Design an enzyme around this catalytic site. Structure first.
Site, mmCIF file in Angstrom:
data_model
loop_
_atom_site.group_PDB
_atom_site.id
_atom_site.type_symbol
_atom_site.label_atom_id
_atom_site.label_comp_id
_atom_site.label_asym_id
_atom_site.label_seq_id
_atom_site.Cartn_x
_atom_site.Cartn_y
_atom_site.Cartn_z
ATOM 1 N N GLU A 212 0.855 -1.191 0.000
ATOM 2 C CA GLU A 212 0.000 0.000 0.000
ATOM 3 C C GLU A 212 0.882 1.229 0.000
ATOM 4 O O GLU A 212 1.737 1.384 0.899
ATOM 5 C CB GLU A 212 -0.898 -0.042 1.255
ATOM 6 C CG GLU A 212 -1.814 1.188 1.391
ATOM 7 C CD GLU A 212 -2.717 1.153 2.601
ATOM 8 O OE1 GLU A 212 -2.731 0.129 3.358
ATOM 9 O OE2 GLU A 212 -3.455 2.152 2.828
ATOM 10 N N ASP A 214 0.337 5.016 0.656
ATOM 11 C CA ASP A 214 -0.599 6.075 1.068
ATOM 12 C C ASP A 214 -0.006 7.425 0.668
ATOM 13 O O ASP A 214 0.753 8.049 1.394
ATOM 14 C CB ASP A 214 -0.846 5.991 2.577
ATOM 15 C CG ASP A 214 -1.611 4.752 2.930
ATOM 16 O OD1 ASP A 214 -2.564 4.415 2.150
ATOM 17 O OD2 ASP A 214 -1.238 4.027 3.852
ATOM 18 N N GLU A 217 -3.265 10.808 3.240
ATOM 19 C CA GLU A 217 -4.274 10.548 4.269
ATOM 20 C C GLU A 217 -4.389 11.837 5.001
ATOM 21 O O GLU A 217 -3.398 12.322 5.547
ATOM 22 C CB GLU A 217 -3.881 9.418 5.168
ATOM 23 C CG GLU A 217 -3.866 8.079 4.417
ATOM 24 C CD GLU A 217 -3.507 6.938 5.297
ATOM 25 O OE1 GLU A 217 -2.289 6.770 5.616
ATOM 26 O OE2 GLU A 217 -4.434 6.186 5.691
ATOM 27 N N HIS A 228 3.897 1.387 2.777
ATOM 28 C CA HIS A 228 3.713 0.153 3.606
ATOM 29 C C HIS A 228 4.119 -1.062 2.790
ATOM 30 O O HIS A 228 3.394 -1.521 1.918
ATOM 31 C CB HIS A 228 2.270 -0.057 3.977
ATOM 32 C CG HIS A 228 1.647 0.989 4.852
ATOM 33 N ND1 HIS A 228 1.394 0.737 6.187
ATOM 34 C CD2 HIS A 228 1.066 2.186 4.576
ATOM 35 C CE1 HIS A 228 0.725 1.763 6.706
ATOM 36 N NE2 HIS A 228 0.515 2.652 5.753
#
Ligand SMILES: OCC(CO)NC[C@@H](O)COc1cc2ccccc2c2ccccc12
Ligand SMILES: *[C@@H]1O[C@H](CO)[C@@H](O)[C@H](O)[C@H]1NC(C)=O
Ligand SMILES: [Co+2]
Ligand SMILES: [Co+2]
Length: 434
Positions: A212, A214, A217, A228
């Site tokens: 993942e 990101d 956010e 991640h």
């Protein structure tokens, strides 16, 4: 699961620009699709619910395989049920939408055709978008991120999934989510435990893991950038507590890193960079542009533009690290100063580069957090820590903020708007749109 058509499925169109190194960009036409968990799941031959509230039908769904054979996903009324709309290059997501029932949020994927997701290879490239976070208070997360999902939503691997990307199947992320109702073409009824604080959700015996990125956010108070890694790059089922992540009793005992190497300028000490109004470098009452660059070393660079003024990611000093590039010196320093070993245990930026070298699917979402009230993003976390604990303070929100029922009650008209997505080689996305 199969697909049913009691409700037609028309994906709201969405355009984006593909830029080339030679200085031009060309418009691409895609669309967005809502994730299968938000849909109605019912019997293939009637309107009887397979899942209702936070429980499954014990007769339609006595086990994971039988349930998938008996049940289908239906179409979505994007604006009237889910508060989702698009216009040209812009996508908007409302928070609480009242129709015959109440809906909260959405998770959406960018498609390439009505039956396939768009894949992006991030490595060597940059991704730019504009966002308006002004209507996002403490406790909400308007997220824009990538995950290593299959372009078909899992159909080629899992024959009993015939619904596919057209119906938003196949999700995975670094939390190895166990709240998914279908994983690997089977239901997740086995081991299901309804959520005590959420009438609509639960946790099953299986989860769905993958890498993942990101990108974003954020709300009007805080923002973070977080890769991640996972030891298996792409989508993979996991078993119960062996999943790790948010939905397991043990968060750190799985194949993915659920915490990531986050870069949150506020957390790193620049509490003046991002917030509502003219006292911040970036005024979150107004639209802003966010550019994220994936250099081939595996490091990540970031700059912002607002009202024609450009700002690199602010410099930070943390242990022996100094700079504004998210590189493995930063991530190692962050573990040493703030704690944790998850990111390095799962291979750090070297392992993460295996995800960005391959294809990833673009996800845009708006959510509230029924596990930790978003405090990890925008408050002090864990809440018993103080500013004397390095890294505990992530943002200025109260440690009482973000209770889902409360923000759903107080801020139902919250929304996020993402727009003007541009993607291409590093250095290319600031050139004129086609
Ligand atoms: O916004 C998209 C999501 C996709 O699921 N991105 C990652 C998000 O799930 C990370 O969440 C957390 C990230 C996190 C990072 C450090 C420490 C604790 C947490 C944490 C604690 C409880 C609940 C969630 C978290
Ligand atoms: C925060 O970052 C901005 C952008 O780099 C910089 O102009 C400003 O001086 C920084 N402020 C503090 C207090 O670090
Ligand atoms: Co199993
Ligand atoms: Co570099």
């Amino acid at each position: 699961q199969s697909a049913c058509t009691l409700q037609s499925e028309t994906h709201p169109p969405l355009t984006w620009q593909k830029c080339s190194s030679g200085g031009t960009c060309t418009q691409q036409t895609g669309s967005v699709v809502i994730d299968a968990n938000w849909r109605w799941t019912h019997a293939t031959n009637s309107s009887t619910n397979c899942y209702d509230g936070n429980t499954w039908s014990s007769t339609l769904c006595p086990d994971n395989e039988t349930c998938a054979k008996n049940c289908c996903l239906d179409g979505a009324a994007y604006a009237s049920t889910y508060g989702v709309t698009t216009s040209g290059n812009s996508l908007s997501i409302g928070f609480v939408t009242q129709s015959a029932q109440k809906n909260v949020g959405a998770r959406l994927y960018l498609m390439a055709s009505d039956t396939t997701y768009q894949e992006f290879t991030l490595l060597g490239n940059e991704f730019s978008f504009d966002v308006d976070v002004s209507q996002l208070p403490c406790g909400l997360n308007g997220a824009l991120y990538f995950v290593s999902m299959d372009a078909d939503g899992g159909v080629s691997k899992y024959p009993t999934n015939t619904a596919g990307a057209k119906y938003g199947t196949g999700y995975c992320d670094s939390q190895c989510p166990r709240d998914l109702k279908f994983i690997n073409g089977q239901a997740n009824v086995e081991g299901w435990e309804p959520s005590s604080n959420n009438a609509n959700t639960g946790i099953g015996g299986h989860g769905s893991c993958c890498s993942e990125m990101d990108i974003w956010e954020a709300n009007s108070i805080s923002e973070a950038l977080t890769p991640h890694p996972c030891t298996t790059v792409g989508q993979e089922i996991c078993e119960g507590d062996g999943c790790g992540g948010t939905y397991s009793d043990n968060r750190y005992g799985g194949t993915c890193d659920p915490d990531g190497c986050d870069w949150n300028p506020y957390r790193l000490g620049n509490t003046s960079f991002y917030g509502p109004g003219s006292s911040f470098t970036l005024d979150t009452t107004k639209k802003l542009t966010v550019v994220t660059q994936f250099e081939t070393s595996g490091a990540i660079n970031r700059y912002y533009v607002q009202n024609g003024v450009t700002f690199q990611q602010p410099n930070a000093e943390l242990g022996s690290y100094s700079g504004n590039e998210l590189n493995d010196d930063y991530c190692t320093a962050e573990e040493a100063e703030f704690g944790g070993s998850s990111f390095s245990d799962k291979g750090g930026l070297t392992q993460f580069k295996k995800a960005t070298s391959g294809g990833m699917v673009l996800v845009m979402s708006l959510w509230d957090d029924y596990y930790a009230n978003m405090l990890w993003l925008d408050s002090t976390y864990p809440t018993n820590e103080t500013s004397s604990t390095p890294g505990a303070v992530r943002g200025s929100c109260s440690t009482s903020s973000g209770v889902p029922a409360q923000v759903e009650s107080q801020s139902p008209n919250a929304k996020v708007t993402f727009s003007n997505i541009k993607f291409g080689p590093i250095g290319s996305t600031g050139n004129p749109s086609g």
